[PDB]
Design an enzyme around this catalytic site. Sequence first.
Site, short mmCIF file in Angstrom:
data_model
loop_
_atom_site.label_atom_id
_atom_site.label_comp_id
_atom_site.label_asym_id
_atom_site.label_seq_id
_atom_site.Cartn_x
_atom_site.Cartn_y
_atom_site.Cartn_z
N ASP A 130 90.27 -20.70 -43.35
CA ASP A 130 89.43 -21.59 -44.15
C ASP A 130 89.23 -22.92 -43.44
OD1 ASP A 130 91.46 -23.74 -45.43
OD2 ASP A 130 92.43 -21.77 -45.41
N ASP A 167 92.48 -20.66 -52.66
CA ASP A 167 91.03 -20.68 -52.51
C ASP A 167 90.37 -19.61 -53.36
OD1 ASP A 167 91.05 -22.85 -50.76
OD2 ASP A 167 91.29 -21.56 -48.99
N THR A 195 83.15 -24.70 -47.98
CA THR A 195 83.44 -25.63 -46.86
C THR A 195 83.06 -25.32 -45.38
OG1 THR A 195 85.10 -27.14 -45.93
CG2 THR A 195 85.87 -24.97 -46.62
N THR A 196 83.27 -24.10 -44.88
CA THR A 196 82.95 -23.80 -43.46
C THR A 196 81.45 -23.90 -43.23
OG1 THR A 196 84.89 -22.41 -43.04
CG2 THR A 196 82.98 -22.09 -41.62
N1 ADP Z 1 82.59 -9.17 -47.94
C1 ADP Z 1 81.57 -10.02 -47.26
N2 ADP Z 1 80.62 -9.47 -46.49
C2 ADP Z 1 79.70 -10.21 -45.87
N3 ADP Z 1 79.68 -11.54 -45.98
C3 ADP Z 1 80.61 -12.18 -46.73
C4 ADP Z 1 81.58 -11.43 -47.39
N4 ADP Z 1 82.35 -12.30 -48.04
C5 ADP Z 1 81.90 -13.52 -47.82
N5 ADP Z 1 80.84 -13.45 -47.02
C6 ADP Z 1 80.05 -14.60 -46.53
O1 ADP Z 1 80.81 -15.42 -45.90
C7 ADP Z 1 80.56 -16.91 -46.50
C8 ADP Z 1 81.70 -17.37 -47.32
O2 ADP Z 1 82.92 -17.43 -46.53
P1 ADP Z 1 83.38 -18.88 -45.84
O3 ADP Z 1 82.15 -19.66 -45.46
O4 ADP Z 1 84.23 -18.62 -44.57
O5 ADP Z 1 84.25 -19.74 -46.93
P2 ADP Z 1 84.92 -21.24 -46.62
O6 ADP Z 1 83.89 -22.44 -46.75
O7 ADP Z 1 86.06 -21.45 -47.63
O8 ADP Z 1 85.52 -21.19 -45.17
C9 ADP Z 1 79.47 -16.83 -47.26
O9 ADP Z 1 78.24 -17.13 -46.45
C10 ADP Z 1 79.44 -15.42 -47.74
O10 ADP Z 1 78.17 -15.02 -47.98
#
Ligand code: ADP
Lengths: 508, 508, 502, 73, 68
Positions: free
Chosen positions: B43, B377, B76-77
């Site tokens: 994260d 999270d 966040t990312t």
């Molecule tokens: N099972 C999945 N398959 C494809 N894309 C996913 C999946 N789960 C989450 N995502 C994508 O990944 C992103 C969310 O994860 P992420 O950005 O890493 O969260 P964080 O901000 O906490 O790091 C979103 O763009 C979401 O659409």
Amino acid sequence: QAALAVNISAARGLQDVLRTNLGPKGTMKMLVSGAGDIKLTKDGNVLLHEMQIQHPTASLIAKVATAQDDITGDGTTSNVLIIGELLKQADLYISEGLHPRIITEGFEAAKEKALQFLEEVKVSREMDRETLIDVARTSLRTKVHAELADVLTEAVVDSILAIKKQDEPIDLFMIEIMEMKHKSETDTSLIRGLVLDHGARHPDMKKRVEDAYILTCNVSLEYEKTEVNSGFFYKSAEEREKLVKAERKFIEDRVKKIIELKRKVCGDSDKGFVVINQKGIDPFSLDALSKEGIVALRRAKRRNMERLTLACGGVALNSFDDLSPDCLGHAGLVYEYTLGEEKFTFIEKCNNPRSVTLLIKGPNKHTLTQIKDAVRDGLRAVKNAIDDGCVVPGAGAVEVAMAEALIKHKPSVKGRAQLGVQAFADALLIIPKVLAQNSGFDLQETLVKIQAEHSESGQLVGVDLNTGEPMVAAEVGVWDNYCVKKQLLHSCTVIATNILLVDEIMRA
Amino acid sequence: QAALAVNISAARGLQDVLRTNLGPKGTMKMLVSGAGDIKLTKDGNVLLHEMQIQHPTASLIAKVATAQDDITGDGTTSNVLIIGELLKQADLYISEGLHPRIITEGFEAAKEKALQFLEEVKVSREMDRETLIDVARTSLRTKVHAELADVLTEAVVDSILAIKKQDEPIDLFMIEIMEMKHKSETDTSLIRGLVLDHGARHPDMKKRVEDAYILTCNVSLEYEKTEVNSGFFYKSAEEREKLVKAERKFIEDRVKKIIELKRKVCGDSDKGFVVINQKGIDPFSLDALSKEGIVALRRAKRRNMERLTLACGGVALNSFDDLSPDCLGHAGLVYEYTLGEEKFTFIEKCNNPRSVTLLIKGPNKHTLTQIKDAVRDGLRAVKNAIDDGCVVPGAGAVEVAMAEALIKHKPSVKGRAQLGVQAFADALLIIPKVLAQNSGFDLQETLVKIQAEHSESGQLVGVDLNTGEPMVAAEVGVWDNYCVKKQLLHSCTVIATNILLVDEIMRA
Amino acid sequence: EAVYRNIQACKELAQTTRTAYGPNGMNKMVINHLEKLFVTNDAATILRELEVQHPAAKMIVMASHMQEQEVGDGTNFVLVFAGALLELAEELLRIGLSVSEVIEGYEIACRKAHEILPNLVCCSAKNLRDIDEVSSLLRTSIMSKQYGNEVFLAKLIAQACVSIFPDSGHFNVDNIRVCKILGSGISSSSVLHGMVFKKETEGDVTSVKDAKIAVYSCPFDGMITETKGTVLIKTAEELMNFSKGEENLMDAQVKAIADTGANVVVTGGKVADMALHYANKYNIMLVRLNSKWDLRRLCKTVGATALPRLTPPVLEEMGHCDSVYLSEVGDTQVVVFKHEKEDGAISTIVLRGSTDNLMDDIERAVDDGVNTFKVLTRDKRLVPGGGATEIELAKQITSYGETCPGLEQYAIKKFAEAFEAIPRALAENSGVKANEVISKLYAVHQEGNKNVGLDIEAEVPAVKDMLEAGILDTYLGKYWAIKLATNAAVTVLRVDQIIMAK
Amino acid sequence: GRKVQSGNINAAKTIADIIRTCLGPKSMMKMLLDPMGGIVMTNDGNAILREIQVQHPAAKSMIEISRTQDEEV
Amino acid sequence: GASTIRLLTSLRAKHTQENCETWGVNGETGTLVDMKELGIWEPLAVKLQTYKTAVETAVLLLRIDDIV
Ligand SMILES: Nc1ncnc2c1ncn2[C@@H]1O[C@H](COP(=O)(O)OP(=O)(O)O)[C@@H](O)[C@H]1O
Ligand SMILES: Nc1ncnc2c1ncn2[C@@H]1O[C@H](COP(=O)(O)OP(=O)(O)O)[C@@H](O)[C@H]1O
Ligand SMILES: Nc1ncnc2c1ncn2[C@@H]1O[C@H](COP(=O)(O)OP(=O)(O)O)[C@@H](O)[C@H]1O
């Protein structure tokens, strides 16, 4: 990838070199040779012909672009600029895991769409005086001053209107250029027929020879001394010391032959008979010939002879006698003319006048070469405009039109070539925005304004170069050749292909 | 002075560092502390606390991203990537002399369109357990090993189901994740009720207790006649013998208080009162009350006592005395768990049992900490899902849809803000782009494919990381939170403006 | 870039640890922060000293520690196998395949291996009695660490474990302690029921019945809670007076505190020899020259606890035992505490040898043997080793990879080649070229014999069946070794950058 | 595995990496930088081989055996 | 410009199936094609000579030791 990046960077560098030349309101480049003589030129083809460029791939781009652009008038400046922008747009994805071939096939699909789009975007308009004035303007303004180009338009268009009677795509057989220095450049006019850069030692000539019978054979009114009798300097050179003389009689013998032919063709001594010489002729006999109704001229250059033969009849030959009047031509007015210090005798109103010439009067060499290049560009551009039946408006109008057409065509092309057509559309967008940048109207603002004007109305709208507002290029009178721009797009796609495929630098 | 170029380069660097991390298929990253320990994480919240940010405005971006993501924490990312792509296109457009403030205005207009279109993207439904477990799975899988995510997700959706009565957000008081080092994860599910930081055990003690009442004691063996609990009066003999009195006197008086409480309330201790003693206590109480009904607990922290105060009714009266028999808390079931090396107390079915705990148990240290952060999270994401019934299709689907919507809205935008919204759309393209690169696809064919699928049909299609082919994210079950997307757009736009509007970077 | 760096670091770690793998492993010098120098061929110690400062190396090393604390054998197998995983994953990434595909392929291949390996097993351990049979079962583990003198240690460990292994289906890891009194001859070692110590102060054993133990590192007082009595070393005559005093206190201990559980006092610090004489007169023994771990072991195995400073003894720290008696094993006095399962569950052996380095080698051999006995008691099925199981798994995984269309097959094939890397590790250590022996082993193994492996004894690369040869590993040992090795490999591959935080 | 076979292999790899892109209908263009200043364009590998400089004797022998191949077919 | 590893792996997997020996890669479009269907063909003799000369030059080259 490194070699592709280096090639793209060098192409972008020469693109930035050529960026500022496009458009009438565009800064110039002028070259200096090893001898130090300057060369003013906003033209692109002679520029890439004569530039010394440090880079290599720039050298191949210049060579191939000029070679293929010579066939299609003059469009290589826009060609280099658009391929540089297209290479920029291609690199903006090659940095992101794009293989050159898919981008190339995207360009190919964009080309296939764009040619067929330009097919119905070119407007079918009848050729007339006004449209050819407009195309002559749009050609000349890209090389010379606006007022000076306006002066040129009349001559450059009227010569083409004169030669148009043949109704065939034939050029360069006539309409040769004629150059001379003068105190004022504004004087620059066409001449039906041909211009001789010389006269003769004929004091008080009947300068207005209207019944100008012409037969352009070489008369030896100054016989070259027969120094060669028995070889070089042996003991027999005593013959050479004396046989070098006694050539005075042949001048008067040839003059008597001219008098006999003058009697034969005119039946009297009244009507002016005009004949030529490749070498000099004596003044003393010219005094009598001017009284005999005979006009001999001297120091003629080579190709002008057969040019007079084609324009006014007659034949040219070195062996001379009282030749039979089997080819006697007749000029309607050999307008003997002189201004400044040198005599330039005009030949006009030839019997069935074939040829025409353009008298350009640049004050000095670096302006004379500029005006020469401008005249060649204008004449060849209008020749292309009369070669095809349609003329397409420019000033970035059809460029934004086909860019928007490719944007709408994005879904139609299947697969990963969509970036290819997108980059090609941006490459076409470089043209109106580079015109705006050269004129100075914050290029991107003018680009967004012209795209907004095109989208809301659908009218083929270009940039008004002197005020930045989007204006209908057809109504403003900005016209570009369909053939020139067709081969422009062909060349753009082909050389962009070549530059994307190259991936290695070989020391060999 | 394009001093904003260094800020754009810093955004590029932070984007690259935060690249490769999206999606379940993406990689994770380790944070080597100055102490030399290990910290695996995925994260971006804690990745932007990697104090080796190496550049100051990168630290600015990191801290502002953390601050603006702490409200939702599911988005966040992605924020770093969207701002990086906005600044990439912004650099692409500054490189032609365009001023960044109109770019920021175009970004603001793009955000205004994107939020409205997102309000229509979101689906609204009653959060049944199937959709809830799907959204928990798709939120947690992007941070944990795929084979282990589901066993956590079931406990997560159970935890969020335990508090469905009222719209109140996530609170740690009803969900307290608890961890201990063990050989294997082995079904790291929640336990209903509260779990204690430790436990007390004796071979005669009871394993399970039902209807157990509960209180606490800060002082039960330490001091006498005073409320203080500190260092004994070694410096004062006159106050020292009271401190050897205290243990005997209170293990007499207060223990009889407990036994008379349990005798009168329960009918001779039939309901088994239990007591949480906050610290160590003489084994007289522990090893003898094992048969005397009472379950005496040892070495528990205060936070446990406030948690159980909320979790069992009454109050954790730090003053020992049972001044009111109805001041007691109550537990429905109690289980002194022992697993691996250490023992811990469960309390279950207490008065107000809506508080639950998470037995986040597994391999030691870094895996445990990663699991803790990931489950936190996931709980915050499912909180976002419950707070509003709005759910958006993730997996890049919402970004593709927003990009297409802004592309369609582009000609409607007046002026160069058209170019701004173009830049915003091409920046939103990055989420499918980063996801596709993460699972090692061609990545430039994935984007074209997904755009073509979204343009041919109206489906909210996104990239599926296991196949790359476009497929409707809605029925696949890869959901996402509408609120985190709204906050994502807001934070992205505001910080893209605040970073792009830098000029003449100067030291303080 | 950082992925390749992590792979290179783990590759060099697995390479420098690989040379000790197998019975004929190559020793290495160890210089810890105590600066003592000794030669060993044990993965656990060689890694415990080797400062693996690279975080990926530390990750694999702690995965090996988790494997070791869960299961005895295979701690070097984890290192070499994770190294093979990472080298072949580096090869796949050099081909161009992404990290996600290779890690998912390794995960599915590990699942397939865990699914098919229970079908790979060929024999199961019979009843743990009949010291010959359990010796034959420890054979592989005992030979793995020490070679040249192997049957004796197998019999020693078998006798030690079986003499204490209870009738219940449970056995405890902290059972066999080792005593390393110096002296000529390894073969002079023996086992005793209960715990023994190397050598201490002299004494006549009177606690041979109803033995109880006290343990003081503090002034030698041992008063009962109902009286006050102490020794203070300040002048000689009253020092003797106290010595008499606490000897009478020891008598009071063995009388009354024996009910709580104190007869014999364990002294951390040295006491006067004349006080030893008084202890002899009044029938109380004592033990001296014990490290703090020795006191911890003795007190835990009786239920006692060492006192850091003076405190009257209480039942909270009393120790219980059946007998304290003596034996001159190896012609040297050793004390023994004997149990009758009141606490019990402990047996201790005496180590015999002429060097502390060989003493530690025997110690690691004993530890691995007793841990093998651990994992055999709870999982009686166990796998043919010596390269046979790794290659049978390799062939099965290759077949599975050919069975799996599309991608993920690169990781399957390279996981099978990681299996292939194990008999390479045996080959380089055994003095036979790896490629010839591995190819001959495939030649004899794809035919379905399924129990062929690298024959060490042959000077030429050749194979033999390990089933009748007595080379065979534990099922759970290899199962968890491969499981955490693949977990370490998949976790380290999932790190694309090394980042520092404050 | 002496250094000479490694050099042979390295030269073969360099020349094959140069030639690879010339295979197939979609073959790449290649750049020939003659130190006189001009450039020779080429699509196929034989043309680039006929004038590529190979200072390493292993690559030179590779060119000779390529000549032996191409003279036959 | 296709998936150099993914699509080639798919081609190999197809080639693991019998009667698919004709299946190949379309150089014009960068996708797998049953090359019998396109009609683009190639003779036995040139391929035999190509492989023979390739292995021959490999054998010649990796046997060399270079000495003036
Ligand atoms: N099972 C999945 N398959 C494809 N894309 C996913 C999946 N789960 C989450 N995502 C994508 O990944 C992103 C969310 O994860 P992420 O950005 O890493 O969260 P964080 O901000 O906490 O790091 C979103 O763009 C979401 O659409
Ligand atoms: N008066 C004008 N107003 C606006 N644009 C003009 C005008 N004259 C010429 N142009 C533009 O100049 C472009 C091409 O000129 P240019 O490439 O410089 O000539 P050449 O290639 O012969 O050197 C055309 O696209 C045309 O639209
Ligand atoms: N007699 C033997 N012949 C061949 N290989 C053996 C033999 N004994 C042990 N091995 C190999 O050595 C492995 C266990 O020993 P090793 O890994 O070197 O040390 P450790 O058991 O401490 O991890 C076994 O899994 C087996 O593969």
